[PDB]
Design a protein around this nucleic acid. Structure first.
Ligand SMILES: [Ca+2]
Ligand SMILES: [Ca+2]
Ligand SMILES: [Zn+2]
Length: 845
RNA sequence: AACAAGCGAAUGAGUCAUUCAUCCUAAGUCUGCAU
RNA sequence: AUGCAGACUUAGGAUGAAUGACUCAUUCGCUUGUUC
């Protein structure tokens, strides 16, 4: 419901590329352009794609206008290079012929040329929007290839005017005729002739008896050359989102469908079909360049003014790209990284800014700085939500300038200006709304968690490219209340030098010979030592605040950099084992930091002594694990020594990590990743398909928890005891995982629900409560080319369920008839339940 | 890769609901103990 | 009053799983219309 939440889908607008904006539409005299060269080169060496030239009014940003992108076609891959060229001038005759080329081929293949009648006859320039006009036209191989453009412009004046075989345009040799571009005149769609039938004509068999009857009835047009061979020619299809590798290099080899037109209906174009094949690549290439242009525009808006700093447009691009956008990149890792950069920087800034606020009000002031609500506020105020690439990317909808837009989404979003203002009625809590789908004015539904993710992802993107300083610039550019004011960190040492160090028993020396750092101040490490039970003016609660953040950031920087192909949720699984406070307790004991936690609490002394007693020497070399948890003060010392390491070392994070990398020597790698037993238990029980009753209680001092798991014949009960009962659930789950890894008329079903998940919903909630394992389905389909109360379909799935009902013999049943696959399962569950009622197991009422 | 649509499926997401979890941080109440 | 402990709940960040339903993308089978 709140700003920054996932549930509030809020409508935002898209930003125009600002370099695709040309004012050169409707000049009187020829307009000058900056050119970029699209070199397409396939991995198959048998067929060539033509190189194109993008002709913008404005220069590109040298990171956009020199980029290589891979295009994943069907069963082949094309490298597209966007190397620059020179500034190219175009005369008005050249400018009209270039606009005719672009408008002709994009409208003839992707659009509908012959609207209704020829599109280029009726008035254009409505189709040349000034927000998006770029004039992309082939090159002869930095050249510009006026041969194909002149042929296309000549066939434009032709169609406005409307042994060798005869096209409507011109005659052609019968042999040098295959694989050439051709536009049919009676329905204006570009073809490309694969072959001419060797022994066929307009009289060939086609509810039409023949081809010439088909044209004489459908179009009413007398073929004045029936003798000549009608031509099989592959049609012009639509463009297909080459930017993502969807097939993963499923889709089977489909034959080309060819149309067969008499050559009189065809008009010859001297455009090669190298050009025609390259145009199918242009919607995805220009969508990628459009996106990189917005990314570099964001980079320019953010600036940096740093002498040694540069950030790619591809990394800004991935930082704005929500996962609703099927792509290779998806911002999710950068926004985990930027969550932790932001949390570090916010904690370090509040630590240094407020030397008197303790762990709680520092932590709450951080909750005000680092929230998704705060980052959503500072991102939408900064108008960074327009750069969000939260879109599926319909290439069918991609229209070049001059192309008609056969697929318009007319802006019924209620706002008539481009950029929406953040007001409610542009917020929606409901389902059925389509997140990502733009209208034609560029407005689309954004999850609003992804706006805050945008913020964090650009914090992380400037972190990767510029280190801490450029990420801190990105944060101040958003308006994050951080400044880092470096003498202020010196002022912290000037809150340390005034105190008289208390270096009494040379305790710090032994502690520093455990952590291999010198401590040029030594009161930071005394404060990181000092527990709140000593009742001093100082304590480690404030340095543990700082060190929670510096360790969460140093570890997720390690995890971001090492594991480059795994996203959040495995990085969060790994971070919740490195920054786990139990792990910090084992790291405190393993390096023996725990003998320097200075405290005056006897109950904390018996918690330390129980936890040192709980360590068991392992069965193989490994690591000495504990039996029980052991208190937070152990791990809080580890955090606070990291926090003292920052303020000691003038916030040098490479030094803080140079010290703390050998501390947790066995860093968790995702092979070595062992999740908490409860999580791993109910993930394994749900993935295999079983449930467990769970029961925890507080009998004596320490809590008890039993877990009755039901496998198919037995109910096996794993039970454990621990202080917290979340960890008694953890130990009962670990007991159950050991004794599971060795192995690896009374009930009321309640009312059957409807709305197509209802019966499987009720039987699943029933199997969880009255503990039976999940029913497994066996659907059966009889697909028919004839259609099948009912609404129509063509498969008629009749499904039978099984349920391995415990302490009974198993039961399979079936469903009458269902068009859907989900419904078949549903009706099979219903006929099962009524059958079960008859079998004296459950009562529906 | 003819095109649009509808229907069915498969796969990957996102989101909601349900009911459960993990990790870090703060806090409140209730219960217990003790100084 | 303070400390500790546990339950519960909330707030903040990062998340994950089963089930159910949408939605999207990609892909396939069919159907109709269109092209043929
Ligand atoms: Ca986030
Ligand atoms: Ca801690
Ligand atoms: Zn709109």
């Amino acid at each position: 419901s709140a700003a920054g939440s996932k549930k509030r889908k809020e409508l935002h607008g898209t930003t125009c590329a600002n370099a695709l904006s040309g004012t050169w539409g409707e000049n009187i005299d020829g307009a000058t352009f900056q050119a970029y060269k699209f070199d397409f080169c396939c991995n198959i060496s048998g067929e060539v794609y033509s190189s194109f030239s993008l002709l913008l009014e404005s220069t590109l940003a040298e990171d956009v206008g020199k980029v290589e992108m891979d295009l994943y076609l069907v069963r082949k891959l094309v490298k597209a290079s966007v190397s620059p060229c020179g500034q190219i001038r175009l005369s008005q005759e050249e400018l009209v012929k270039a606009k005719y080329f672009q408008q002709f081929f994009f409208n003839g293949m992707f659009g509908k040329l012959f609207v209704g009648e020829f599109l280029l006859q009726t008035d254009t320039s409505s189709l040349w929007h000034p927000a998006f006009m770029f004039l992309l036209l082939p090159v002869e191989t930095a050249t510009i290839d006026w041969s194909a453009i002149n042929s296309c412009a000549s066939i434009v004046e032709f169609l406005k005017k409307n042994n060798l075989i005869h096209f409507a345009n011109a005659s052609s040799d019968k042999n040098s005729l295959e694989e050439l571009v051709v536009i049919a005149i009676h329905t204006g769609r570009i073809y490309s002739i694969v072959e001419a039938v060797s022994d066929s004509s307009a009289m060939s068999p086609f509810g039409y008896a023949t081809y010439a009857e088909y044209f004489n009835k459908k179009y009413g047009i007398v073929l004045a050359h029936p003798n000549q061979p009608l031509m099989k020619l592959k049609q012009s299809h639509h463009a297909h989102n080459l930017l993502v590798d969807f097939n993963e290099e499923v889709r089977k080899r489909k034959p080309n469908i060819h149309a067969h037109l008499p050559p009189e209906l065809l008009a010859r174009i001297d455009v090669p079909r190298a050009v025609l094949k390259s145009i199918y690549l242009l919607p995805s290439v220009m969508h990628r360049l459009e996106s990189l242009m917005l990314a570099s525009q964001l980079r320019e808006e953010i600036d940096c003014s740093i002498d040694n700093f540069s950030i790619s447009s591809t990394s800004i691009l991935e930082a704005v790209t929500t996962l609703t956008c099927p792509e290779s990149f998806s911002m999710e890792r950068l926004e985990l990284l930027g969550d932790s950069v932001l949390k570090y920087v916010a904690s370090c800034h509040l630590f240094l800014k407020y030397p008197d606020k303790d762990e709680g009000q520092l932590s709450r002031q951080r909750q005000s700085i680092i929230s998704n609500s705060n980052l959503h506020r500072l991102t939408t105020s900064r108008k960074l939500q327009g750069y969000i690439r939260n879109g599926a990317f319909e290439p069918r909808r991609w229209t070049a300038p001059g192309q008609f837009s056969l697929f318009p989404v007319p802006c019924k979003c209620g706002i008539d200006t481009r950029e929406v203002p953040l007001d409610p009625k542009f917020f929606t809590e409901n389902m059925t709304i389509k997140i990502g789908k733009s209208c034609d004015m560029g407005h689309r539904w954004v999850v609003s968690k992804s706006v805050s993710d945008c913020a964090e992802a650009l914090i992380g993107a400037y972190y990767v490219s510029g280190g801490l300083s450029a990420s801190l610039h990105m944060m101040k550019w958003l308006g994050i209340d951080v400044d880092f004011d470096p003498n202020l960190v010196v002022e912290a040492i000037n809150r340390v030098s005034l105190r008289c160090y208390i270096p009494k028993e040379d305790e710090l020396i032994e502690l520093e010979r455990k952590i291999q750092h010198e401590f040029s101040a030594k009161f930071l490490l005394k404060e990181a030592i000092t527990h709140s039970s000593l009742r001093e003016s100082y304590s480690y609660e404030r340095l543990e605040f700082l060190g929670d953040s510096v360790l969460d950031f140093l570890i997720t920087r390690h995890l971001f950099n090492t594991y480059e192909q795994t996203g959040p949720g495995e990085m969060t699984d790994l971070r919740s084992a490195c920054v786990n406070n139990e792990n910090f307790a084992q790291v405190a004991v393993k390096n023996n930091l725990h003998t320097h936690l200075q405290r005056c609490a006897t109950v904390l002394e018996t918690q330390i002594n129980d936890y040192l007693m709980s360590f068991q020497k392992p069965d193989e070399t490994g690591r000495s694990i504990p039996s029980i948890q052991g208190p937070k003060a152990l791990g809080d010392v580890v955090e606070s020594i990291a926090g003292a390491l920052l303020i000691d070392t003038r916030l040098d994070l490479d030094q803080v990590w140079r010290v703390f990398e050998p501390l947790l020597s066995p860093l968790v790698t995702p092979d070595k990743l062992q999740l908490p037993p409860y999580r791993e238990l109910n993930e394994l029980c749900d993935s295999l398909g079983y449930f467990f009753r769970v029961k925890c209680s507080n009998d004596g001092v320490k809590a008890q928890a039993t877990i009755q798991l039901q496998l198919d014949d037995v109910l096996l009960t794993g039970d454990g005891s621990e202080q917290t009962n979340k960890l008694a659930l953890g130990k009962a789950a670990s007991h159950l995982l050991t004794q599971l890894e060795k192995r690896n008329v009374i009930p009321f079903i309640g009312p059957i629900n409807m709305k197509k998940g209802g019966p499987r919903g009720t039987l699943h909630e029933f199997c969880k409560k009255h503990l039976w394992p999940m029913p497994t389905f066996d659907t059966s389909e009889e697909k028919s080319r004839t259609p099948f109360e009912k609404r129509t379909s063509f498969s008629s799935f009749t499904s039978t369920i099984t349920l391995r009902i415990p302490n009974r013999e198993a039961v399979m049943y079936a469903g009458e008839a269902r068009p859907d696959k989900k419904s078949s399962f549903d009706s099979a569950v219903v006929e099962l339940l009524y059958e079960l009622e008859r079998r004296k197991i459950v009562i529906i009422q």
